[PDB]
Amino acid sequence: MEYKDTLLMPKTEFPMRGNLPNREPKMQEQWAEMNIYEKVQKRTEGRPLFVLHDGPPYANGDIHMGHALNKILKDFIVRYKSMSGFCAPYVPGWDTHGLPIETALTKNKKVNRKEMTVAEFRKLCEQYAWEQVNGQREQFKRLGVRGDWDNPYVTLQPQYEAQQIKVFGDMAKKGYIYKGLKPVYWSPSSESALAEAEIEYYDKRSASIYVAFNVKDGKGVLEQDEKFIIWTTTPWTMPANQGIAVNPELQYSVVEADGAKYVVATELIETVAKEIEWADYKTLRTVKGSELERVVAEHPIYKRDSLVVLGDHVTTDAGTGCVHTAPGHGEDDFIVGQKYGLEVLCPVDSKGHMTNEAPGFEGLFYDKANKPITDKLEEEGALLKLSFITHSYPHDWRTKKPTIFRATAQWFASIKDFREDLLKAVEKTKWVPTWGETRLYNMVRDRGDWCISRQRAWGVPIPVFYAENEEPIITDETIEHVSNLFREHGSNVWFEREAKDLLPEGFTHEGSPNGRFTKETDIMDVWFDSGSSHQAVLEEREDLQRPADLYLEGSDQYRGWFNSSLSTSVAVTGEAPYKGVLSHGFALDGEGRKMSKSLGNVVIPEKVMKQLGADILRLWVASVDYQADVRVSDNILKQVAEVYRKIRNTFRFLLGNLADFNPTTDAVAVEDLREVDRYMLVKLNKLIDKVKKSYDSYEFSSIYHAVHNFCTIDMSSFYLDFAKDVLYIEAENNVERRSIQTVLYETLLSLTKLVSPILSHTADEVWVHIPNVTEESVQLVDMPEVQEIEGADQLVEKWDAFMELRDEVLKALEQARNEKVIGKSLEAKLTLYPTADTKELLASISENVGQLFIVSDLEVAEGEAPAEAQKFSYASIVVSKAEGEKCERCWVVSPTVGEDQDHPTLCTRCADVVKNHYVQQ
Ligand SMILES: CC[C@H](C)[C@H](N)C(=O)NS(=O)(=O)NC[C@H]1O[C@@H](n2cnc3c(N)ncnc32)[C@H](O)[C@@H]1O
Ligand SMILES: CC[C@H](C)[C@H](N)C(=O)NS(=O)(=O)NC[C@H]1O[C@@H](n2cnc3c(N)ncnc32)[C@H](O)[C@@H]1O
Numbered sequence: 001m002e003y004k005d006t007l008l009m010p011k012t013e014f015p016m017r018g019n020l021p022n023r024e025p026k027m028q029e030q031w032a033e034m035n036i037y038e039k040v041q042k043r044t045e046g047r048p049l050f051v052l053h054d055g056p057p058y059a060n061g062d063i064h065m066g067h068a069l070n071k072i073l074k075d076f077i078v079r080y081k082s083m084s085g086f087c088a089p090y091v092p093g094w095d096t097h098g099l100p101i102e103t104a105l106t107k108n109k110k111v112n113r114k115e116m117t118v119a120e121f122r123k124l125c126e127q128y129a130w131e132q133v134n135g136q137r138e139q140f141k142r143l144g145v146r147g148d149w150d151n152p153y154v155t156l157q158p159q160y161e162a163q164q165i166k167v168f169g170d171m172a173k174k175g176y177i178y179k180g181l182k183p184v185y186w187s188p189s190s191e192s193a194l195a196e197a198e199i200e201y202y203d204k205r206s207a208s209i210y211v212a213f214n215v216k217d218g219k220g221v222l223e224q225d226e227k228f229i230i231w232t233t234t235p236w237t238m239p240a241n242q243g244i245a246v247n248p249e250l251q252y253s254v255v256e257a258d259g260a261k262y263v264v265a266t267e268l269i270e271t272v273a274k275e276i277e278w279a280d281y282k283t284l285r286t287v288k289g290s291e292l293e294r295v296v297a298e299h300p301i302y303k304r305d306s307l308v309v310l311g312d313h314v315t316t317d318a319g320t321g322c323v324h325t326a327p328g329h330g331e332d333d334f335i336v337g338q339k340y341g342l343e344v345l346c347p348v349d350s351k352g353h354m355t356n357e358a359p360g361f362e363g364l365f366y367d368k369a370n371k372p373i374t375d376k377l378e379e380e381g382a383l384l385k386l387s388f389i390t391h392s393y394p395h396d397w398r399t400k401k402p403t404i405f406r407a408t409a410q411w412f413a414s415i416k417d418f419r420e421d422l423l424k425a426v427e428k429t430k431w432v433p434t435w436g437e438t439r440l441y442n443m444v445r446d447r448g449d450w451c452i453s454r455q456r457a458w459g460v461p462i463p464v465f466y467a468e469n470e471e472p473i474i475t476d477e478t479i480e481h482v483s484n485l486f487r488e489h490g491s492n493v494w495f496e497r498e499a500k501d502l503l504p505e506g507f508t509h510e511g512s513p514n515g516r517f518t519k520e521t522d523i524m525d526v527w528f529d530s531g532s533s534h535q536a537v538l539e540e541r542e543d544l545q546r547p548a549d550l551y552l553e554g555s556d557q558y559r560g561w562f563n564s565s566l567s568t569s570v571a572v573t574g575e576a577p578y579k580g581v582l583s584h585g586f587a588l589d590g591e592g593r594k595m596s597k598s599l600g601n602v603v604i605p606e607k608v609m610k611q612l613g614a615d616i617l618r619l620w621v622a623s624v625d626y627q628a629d630v631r632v633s634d635n636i637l638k639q640v641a642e643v644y645r646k647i648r649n650t651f652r653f654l655l656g657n658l659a660d661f662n663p664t665t666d667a668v669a670v671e672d673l674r675e676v677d678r679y680m681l682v683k684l685n686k687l688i689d690k691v692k693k694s695y696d697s698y699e700f701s702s703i704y705h706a707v708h709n710f711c712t713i714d715m716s717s718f719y720l721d722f723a724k725d726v727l728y729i730e731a732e733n734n735v736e737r738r739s740i741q742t743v744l745y746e747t748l749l750s751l752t753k754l755v756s757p758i759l760s761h762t763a764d765e766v767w768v769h770i771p772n773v774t775e776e777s778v779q780l781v782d783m784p785e786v787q788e789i790e791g792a793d794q795l796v797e798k799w800d801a802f803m804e805l806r807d808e809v810l811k812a813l814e815q816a817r818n819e820k821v822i823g824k825s826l827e828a829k830l831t832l833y834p835t836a837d838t839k840e841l842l843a844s845i846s847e848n849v850g851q852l853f854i855v856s857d858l859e860v861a862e863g864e865a866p867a868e869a870q871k872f873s874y875a876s877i878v879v880s881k882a883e884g885e886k887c888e889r890c891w892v893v894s895p896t897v898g899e900d901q902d903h904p905t906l907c908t909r910c911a912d913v914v915k916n917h918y919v920q921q
């Protein structure tokens with residue numbers, strides 16, 4: 001009214017309190033209406049392509065915080081490359097087959113796969129799949145992820161299944177596919193084989209056994225009174241024993257007497273004495289391990305022949321130098337068993353129950369038969385000691401129940417035949433973090449052959465036929481026919497036709513003169529479905545190319561997608577399907593614990609999406625070291641939300657006091673700018689260069705703090721703080737405020753473009769309040785390009801010292817605020833006693849120091865009288881009262897108030913501004 005003369009923040013069109021949860025959905029509505037993904041893709045249609053191939057998440061259910069972190073990090077890279085001279089097509093995907101879907105339906109929906117036909121259960125899996133891919137798609141959109149959502153890929157599509165058969169066929173033609181009876185992981189709960197990617201390790205309690213094997217034929221080395229000692233944590237494997245293993249040359253065993261003579265490795269005498277609790281024991285003689293070859297022993301229960309074998313797998317670290325060898329339940333046992341032609345015995349069926357191969361324990365679950373086995377061992381007297389240990393044990397990745405080794409006929413990919421090319425691909429790939437290279441390298445050099453056959457329904461069947469010779473039929477014509485047949489009708493055609501209707505129209509094989517063929521029923525590993533994505537997506541789709549330039553998935557994918565995709569591509573191409581890998585850790589609670597509902601620490605993405613919003617989560621992703629494990633909690637997100645509050649206030653302030661400025665022609669030249677403004681221009685360009693470099697190096701934590709530092713202290717507390725009382729009081733065409741707001745315009749234009757990859761809900765919201773809008777959204781322009789500023793280094797040194805000195809002056813003002821006598825900064829007059837260095841810097845100031853320090857008046861003298869006021873290390877300061885008339889407009893205490901007859905209550909500055917008009921008003 002009479003006290004105020006406007007000159008406030010006009011543009012409140014950007015609200016202060018951020019109600020993103022109710023505003024962001026409307027923001028996404030306009031993005032979908034304009035089809036912004038197609039716009040940026042069309043704009044960069046001729047630019048070089050940077051492909052970030054999306055790892056297909058499972059459709060097991062709704063998204064968790066880990067899903068969001070994956071997509072948000074992908075969105076950061078794609079958005080930056082879209083507006084940095086690259087074409088960045090991003091198509092989502094979904095891994096649809098496998099146990100993650102069957103187990104979800106079986107447990108949650110209480111359906112029984114054995115109460116319905118295979119076709120019916122597969123149809124139910126297909127229904128639940130599309131339900132989840134639709135639900136996950138909308139949840140990703142709410143987060144604010146840009147991509148080809150209307151045209152994604154799923155693993156159940158016939159085109160994908162057709163190409164996956166081609167991938168399998170190409171490897172088979174190379175000779176990398178074979179079938180054999182080998183021990184592999186078995187899940188009795190799922191009644192199927194498994195691989196390491198389908199295995200989770202948990203601590204499990206197992207019974208430790210020290211058992212004795214009697215000697216029948218010592219071959220002139222041992223008498224019948226000696227007995228071998230065996231340590232085993234798997235009692236159920238005893239009925240399958242066919243031999244005993246000992247190290248031939250490196251380890252020499254001895255005979256120990258504790259009332260009876262036992263055979264044990266020499267280096268384990270003390271360790272075996274404390275376990276069996278021997279009282280008095282004496283060594284008889286020493287025998288080299290190789291001398292014990294072909295010694296015949298007896299089974300403690302069945303008294304069958306057990307052949308002592310030589311192998312390098314037996315170690316001193318075990319409980320005894322002799323190891324029970326069961327070729328049907330162990331990798332190393334199978335290898336040595338085949339070396340000596342030992343029988344392969346697997347008395348355990350697919351459901352984990354003992355079969356007729358174990359006479360005294362038939363029908364028992366393997367874990368439930370451990371106690372009866374020990375009881376029979378103790379009845380025979382061969383049991384020495386029984387104990388219990390807890391150790392990490394493999395478990396099914398879906399049923400969470402333990403797995404066992406079973407020797408069964410399975411399909412394998414011969415990794416050993418091209419392991420060298422796999423190692424070369426890892427060495428030629430760029431890994432971020434760096435340890436990822438050694439992570440996958442060692443996983444390959446120590447990997448065995450990959451079991452790819454699964455005894456389940458929901459998946460892609462293995463395209464192998466069998467003739468009357470029972471010879472597997474794999475050839476390019478059969479592979480081509482089934483691939484085209486799958487492309488038309490899908491994988492369902494395999495489960496609804498006999499073999500002769502799935503073959504070429506006139507195919508005949510030598511092994512079956514009658515033309516009577518049969519088909520395979522096992523399906524492929526779900527990791528093979530995802531590992532064929534590069535051939536079916538990067539190669540088949542025209543919008544993408546192979547190899548992709550980056551893979552971005554979690555740390556668990558080194559066993560999974562990173563490994564399987566490399567295996568299929570190097571088998572076919574010989575080269576890696578990716579030029580680089582970016583790895584992110586897992587999401588944890590505030591105390592570094594797994595987010596499980598059991599702990600009650602789950603941070604639901606939808607929970608944060610509605611309580612806080614999307615850009616808050618986007619900042620949180622950029623606020624953490626994703627490359628390692630990340631910890632999240634509601635309190636942490638509130639801190640991130642508070643940071644967004646400071647960012648939002650700075651943007652509102654920048655938009656507000658910039659309203660009365662049109663930079664179309666009111667642009668102040670760089671030479672005409674204030675040296676104070678020129679320093680901010682240098683700082684802005686340094687910020688642009690650092691942010692763009694950080695995007696290239698993928699260091700988002702640097703961007704998060706750099707922007708936070710640039711706004712909280714550098715701009716809002718130092719530069720905008722001065723402009724809070726200078727911009728609007730002066731004339732609206734004054735070169736001072738016009739030049740300052742050219743800097744504000746440059747910051748607003750550049751910062752809005754910089755933040756666009758990380759935050760877009762607020763970036764486009766600010767982009768609306770831009771005087772010069774040549775593109776509909778901020779995502780349609782490129783990132784700002786750094787521009788050199790003349791005399792930058794000299795001004796950086798000068799004004800960084802000036803910033804330091806101002807902070808000390810503010811500290812002196814805050815000391816006066818502690819006194820609260822003046823209780824004001826602008827009204828206070830200053831008498832300064834600077835150091836020669838400080839005095840030289842003040843002399844170099846060509847601007848008004850009074851307005852910079854937001855003080856009424858400043859005088860400089862070498863009084864050198866400290867009194868009791870203050871003295872900074874570079875200047876002595878006195879905060880004095882001016883005692884003049886206070887202006888009613890600028891609030892500056894100035895003696896000039898009253899000199900103007902028309903405005904006796906205004907100073908000369910305010911009186912001149914009020915009286916004079918530039919051209920109008
Ligand atoms: C199937 C029953 C559960 C696993 C039960 N918690 C249980 O067995 N708990 S335990 O503490 O006995 N676990 C010991 C492990 O060793 C086996 N075991 C237990 N008692 C004996 C025994 N007397 N002789 C041989 N093996 C035995 C169990 O199968 C379990 O894996
Ligand atoms: C590339 C994806 C694989 C082929 C597989 N479908 C898969 O892992 N599917 S998933 O849906 O379970 N996971 C997809 C991505 O999410 C990561 N992830 C899973 N759980 C978490 C977690 N708790 N914290 C952080 N990231 C996590 C996976 O590593 C993968 O990148």
Ligand SMILES: [Cl-]
Nearest residue numbers: 106113189190
């Ligand atoms: Cl089941």
Ligand SMILES: [Cl-]
Nearest residue numbers: 231232233234
């Ligand atoms: Cl063992």
Ligand SMILES: [Cl-]
Nearest residue numbers: 496497498501
């Ligand atoms: Cl048929």
Ligand SMILES: [Cl-]
Nearest residue numbers: 498499518519
């Ligand atoms: Cl058939």
Ligand SMILES: [Li+]
Nearest residue numbers: 638639641642
């Ligand atoms: Li707070």
Ligand code: NA
Nearest residue numbers: 110111112115
């Ligand atoms: Na049913």
Ligand code: NA
Nearest residue numbers: 519520521522
């Ligand atoms: Na079969």
Ligand code: NA
Nearest residue numbers: 455456521522
């Ligand atoms: Na089957």
Ligand SMILES: [Zn+2]
Nearest residue numbers: 887890907910
């Ligand atoms: Zn005034």
